[PDB]
């Protein structure tokens, strides 16, 4: 069934599983036409597919060309997400195929289920958690590789950099989700917190700064204070 | 005109034949049902005064032989049987009519209800859904399960309806995933109409038999089958014009004939709101839509 706070530590057992978030697959800007009507212009997009135990991220870039001459795009996006996830699974050797796939939006269950009918033993599941994967395009290096792409292209990353050398997947996944929660709620401040110190850099093969353990504690606390502030401002508490 | 004699009525039971029914008291001299219109299937069914659970009954057709009802006190229920001795049978029947202990199938001549509910039902097909081929008639009750229900236990007692499942390889061609799931014309026309049912009359016949079992026995898996078979037509963008018009007639009499008080379990809110208002065929059920709204506007 659904993933929620009750069964949260299942993400970190040894059963292979993948989160799928389709929020950035179909991305548009909105603008006025010469005659004063509204039109959209699509920009490049991506399927965020992530194994929360190991940090392996399968960033499938969705080139604007996909949309060309297609109707009901936001609906198609769910089918193209599910088509590309199917293809990824099929591309994986048998022992690397996931036993479960957790979609972060329920609208994807039917498209994914239909596309996985060749894999009856891979369970497609919703979640009740309110995960922040939509803010993945706030991570400068993912946003850069998506925008620049000139064709469909899969790009591989480890979203945890090298953290697992020193902390657990549970802790890794809580840091990632806290970071992304902060970036979602107030990108400008969240990004500020990460880079205010010119001396802590981002390895070319990483996404996030090379913080020491102590510095991560200070960072994590700065992100927590960001998130709480923004809440009282939202609601007047 | 044909007759179904009853040996006796030892226990207080409500007897139904088609859409009609009669209360019969413990050891009341009741000895059959006469004047049954030849030319359609029929069903006789039972509900014991003491067990308002398990409605049961026998689908039959009098062209296929002489049938009668006899209470079995070991198994506890009214059993349909066949009398093979033609002469011995007309003798029992003519003597009970003489004694006038039989009820007359009470058909109004203005009324085509039974015909419309059973237009496409054929006994040869019923006996493939209810396999028990030492009998020419067929038993159904409240508790019997379908082949699809069984898959998710005793197969001798199963309702072998055609399995319909919208999220199956059968329903969905590789490469046409989104296409075939939003527009089921492929599944309806090639897989089911041409492939399995051969023609629309067998399809409509199963649809109607499923409805009828839901209605007369509250057989839940039957209701699921009827809903699934409507849903596949209304979710097909391409349907023969003749099927659509007929479907609108078929459903109209099914809704007309349903007891008003049962509309909560026998009618699936989602399916009907989709079919009548969201599907490709919204605009093609004008009579089914008008009757649903003026009779069950709540469910919608």
Swiss-Prot record, chain A:
Residues 7-237 are annotated as: RNase H homology domain. Changing residue 23 to A: Reduced growth at 30 degrees Celsius. Strongly reduced growth at 16 degrees Celsius. It is found in: Nucleus. Changing residue 21 to N: Reduced growth at 30 degrees Celsius. Strongly reduced growth at 16 degrees Celsius. Transmembrane segments: none annotated. The MPN (JAB/Mov34) domain has structural similarity with deubiquitinating enzymes, but lacks the residues that would bind the catalytic metal ion. Present with 468 molecules/cell in log phase SD medium. Component of the U4/U6-U5 tri-snRNP complex composed of the U4, U6 and U5 snRNAs and at least PRP3, PRP4, PRP6, PRP8, PRP18, PRP31, PRP38, SNU13, SNU23, SNU66, SNU114, SPP381, SMB1, SMD1, SMD2, SMD3, SMX2, SMX3, LSM2, LSM3, LSM4, LSM5, LSM6, LSM7, LSM8, BRR2 and DIB1. Functions as a scaffold that mediates the ordered assembly of spliceosomal proteins and snRNAs. Required for association of BRR2 with the spliceosomal U5 snRNP, and the subsequent assembly of the U4/U6-U5 tri-snRNP complex. Functions as a scaffold that positions spliceosomal U2, U5 and U6 snRNAs at splice sites on pre-mRNA substrates, so that splicing can occur. Interacts with both the 5' and the 3' splice site, as well as the branch region. Has a role in branch site-3' splice site selection. Associates with the branch site-3' splice 3'-exon region. Also has a role in cell cycle. This is Pre-mRNA-splicing factor 8. The chain holds residues 1836 to 2069 of 2413 of the full protein.
Curated annotation (Swiss-Prot), chain B:
GO terms for biological process: spliceosomal snRNP assembly; spliceosomal tri-snRNP complex assembly. Residues 244-265 are annotated as: Leucine-zipper. The gene is AAR2. Component of the U5 snRNP complex that is required for spliceosome assembly and for pre-mRNA splicing. Involved in splicing pre-mRNA of the A1 cistron and other genes that are important for cell growth. Keywords: Cytoplasm, mRNA processing, mRNA splicing, Nucleus, Phosphoprotein. CDD domains: Aar2_C, Aar2_N. The modification Phosphothreonine is found at residue 257. Changing residue 236 to A: No effect on interaction with PRP8. The modification Phosphoserine is found at residue 236. It is found in: Cytoplasm; Nucleus. Phosphorylated on serine and tyrosine residues. The keyword Nucleus applies. It comes from the Eukaryota. The keyword Nucleus applies. It comes from Saccharomyces cerevisiae (strain ATCC 204508 / S288c) (Baker's yeast). Present with 7330 molecules/cell in log phase SD medium. Belongs to the AAR2 family. This is A1 cistron-splicing factor AAR2.
